[PDB]
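Holo model, UYM. Inputs:
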Amino acid sequence: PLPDFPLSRRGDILPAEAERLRAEQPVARVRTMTGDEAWLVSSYELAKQVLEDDRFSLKDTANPGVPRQYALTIPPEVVNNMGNINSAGLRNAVMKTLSPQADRELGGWLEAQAHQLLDRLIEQGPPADLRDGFTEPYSAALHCRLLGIPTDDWRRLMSGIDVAFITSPRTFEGSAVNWYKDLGYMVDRLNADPEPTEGLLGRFAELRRSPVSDELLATVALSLFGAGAVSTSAFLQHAIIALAQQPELADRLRAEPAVIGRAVDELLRYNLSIGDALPRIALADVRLGEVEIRAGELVLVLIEGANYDPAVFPHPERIDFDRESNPHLAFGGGQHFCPASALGRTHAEIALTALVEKLPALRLALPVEQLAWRPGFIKRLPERLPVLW
Amino acid sequence: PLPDFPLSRRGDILPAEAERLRAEQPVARVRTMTGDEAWLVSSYELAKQVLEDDRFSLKDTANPGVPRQYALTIPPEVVSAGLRNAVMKTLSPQADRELGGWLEAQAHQLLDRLIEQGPPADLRDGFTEPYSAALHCRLLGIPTDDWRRLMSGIDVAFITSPRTFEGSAVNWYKDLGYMVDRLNADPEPTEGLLGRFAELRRSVSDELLATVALSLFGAGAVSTSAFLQHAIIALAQQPELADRLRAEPAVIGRAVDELLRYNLSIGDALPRIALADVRLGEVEIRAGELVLVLIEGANYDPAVFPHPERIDFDRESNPHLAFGGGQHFCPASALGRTHAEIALTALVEKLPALRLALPVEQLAWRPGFIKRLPERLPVLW
Ligand code: HEM
Ligand code: HEM
Ligand SMILES: O=C1N[C@@H](Cc2c[nH]c3ccccc23)C(=O)N[C@H]1Cc1c[nH]c2ccccc12
Ligand SMILES: Nc1ncnc2[nH]cnc12
Ligand SMILES: Nc1ncnc2[nH]cnc12
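Output:
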């Protein structure tokens, strides 16, 4: 009887199953939701090894006929987004866009967005949903600025993410319809009569007049927006649950705002926003711990396994803003380490700073056990994050 | 070990458990989510009997000390004042006249928006919620501009919790305050229940007025939106029903009536306190015990409805309990039906290739709510 993957949808405590797997079979054979078999790696040491060993391929997880943890919801070519981006001389436009340094006003503008969104929830009074009222509009607004598009249609863009990022046992119609719908949005914004200045679409319009089709440009835009928005909103929601359940943390923040950096780094270690594992196909037979992994097999990295490993993190179950060291995997590791890590931090640091200043009596409106955790999604997240203040 | 209540939040099929319960113990001792016990009544004969007998009270369900299927969220005096005329005149679709053509303009505008974006769309946030909110804002004579906020209030108000939670009261007072201010607007409200209430305290506190307004807005928007999502699933999964409605638009009344019998929007049971020792089938219910009517139990009862598991827009007869029965039979039934007839008519006209964007098995069913509903209702056309 293989343990079933994925683990619990509930994102406010580490699933007891992640603790058991890391302790008894840090490389366990598991059955994914497709019915394919996989190697789930749940210890820090072995997770870092997989991430840092190039014979475990990310690109190759989209190949036809390989074992899948769930259906492809995007074209095969996009699962190697950083690959293709690098190979087209597009890396510079993308890397300038992802660099927080490269946009001197980003900080002040993110800060202003966070303040106005919370000011709107304070105008109506508690309770409010901090997902629909804060994390979603805030993450959408960041990513509209990164692309250089307006914010008018954020709701329909974030609805695109509600479909794009579904984990299904089999392909579903409408995963592709969804992809081509918002690809179309990105192509229209890029080929606008007042041609787009500002953003990655600004840099893309500059770039296709030098000596890369419209479809690949739109593809990069759409794939960066959905990856960034889904990841930032989900992380921020779990960071918000941490501050609501542990108000001592929001007190430290208010008392000592400069510790927000180290604080977000700990919330990143602790956050359970990743609803699945980082996938790789073995390109060769590899001895990983006590298991022989055959070429062509699927390897699944359990970030929450590694980031809660008591071998590396003392008292891993307890949030601690004063860790001497924090070599966490929340951004992954090796060659596919998140290229937007600095931007992820800046996003969270600013939203969290604004929130503890604007809602100093922030708490869940109801017991944490009664939050609705989203099923069948790449991220764990509360469908609604009702709070009081 | 007692069977657990409530049953599955899955709303696309009748829970197997409801079938086993109706078959083997149609009056069943269950543990509610509060850990209290109750009698779950799952056959039509006994469901109909509890609803039509006044030895079972709904008002007493809110009394202190009684067993509960879940915690109160609203004040106890809301589960005599000569308002009955203002309220009943509002719940009459034939006192707003333009309602029909207005709701139809609403449905079409909401749908025209999604057709412009192109599929997929979420028919909950893009259709049922804006549409249901629109109805109830017109009912109260208030603008529709704060519909997201108002429907968010419903997301907290209609939670099923084992124990009470803060926020239930905060949420209640936040929106009471909202209704009190629309009641007391400088250009006094004219039109709607508020309009009528304004004229009816010139002839009952502002507290009580906004309290009726808010409970009415609450119960109707949550109920019409949830039912319309089930009817939409029915028409997506069974596109022959949508072909029927395009071919024969006049059957929408019979059709919406069968979709009512079939729908699993009601996610709890209709609660009664026994005001006395009453025998029900083979069970001696003692005074002050909680009785719970499982509507999907009665509406799928084959002793009354042939082939209950199948939707038939052509049944000779359809005496369904979707609106309840006896003294507490839904007072807004016709408004309920009108809401759904006009949205579904508009839906099968505008989106004739309507289908789910994925297998119905993979919809997210909302937990811990009075309604069974899909958190999202993603569709293609
Ligand atoms: C708190 C926020 C974020 C978290 C927790 C996060 C986490 C991660 C992780 C763990 C990976 C590695 C995937 C793997 O190894 O298979 C990754 C990669 C990636 N992330 Fe992030 N991410 C965040 C924000 C963002 C943002 C804002 C963007 C873009 C706007 C972004 C775009 C990407 C891209 C393009 C990759 C793929 C890189 C490659 O394959 O080489 N991320 N992210
Ligand atoms: C199609 C949607 C609707 C369905 C499925 C529905 C269902 C029901 C049911 C089953 C009851 C009986 C309660 C019980 O016996 O415990 C009820 C009662 C009630 N409904 Fe409707 N309802 C709908 C529409 C509405 C609307 C539009 C309104 C008003 C705006 C409304 C307001 C009420 C009120 C006030 C009661 C309580 C009556 C009493 O206690 O005597 N409902 N509803
Ligand atoms: O840029 C990418 N790089 C990798 C890894 C990755 C980066 N950020 C993520 C966030 C969630 C899951 C995977 C990733 C990938 O696999 N695809 C895309 C992102 C993406 C856009 N829409 C999607 C729908 C479905 C799955 C992935 C994507
Ligand atoms: N595969 C993945 N699952 C969840 N979150 C991610 N962030 C980046 N890649 C991811
Ligand atoms: N008890 C109840 N549960 C669900 N929906 C209702 N509509 C009216 N009363 C209801």
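Residues 16-388 of chain A form a domain with the Cytochrome p450 fold (CATH 1.10.630.10). Chain A has one domain: 16-388.
Archived with the compound record.
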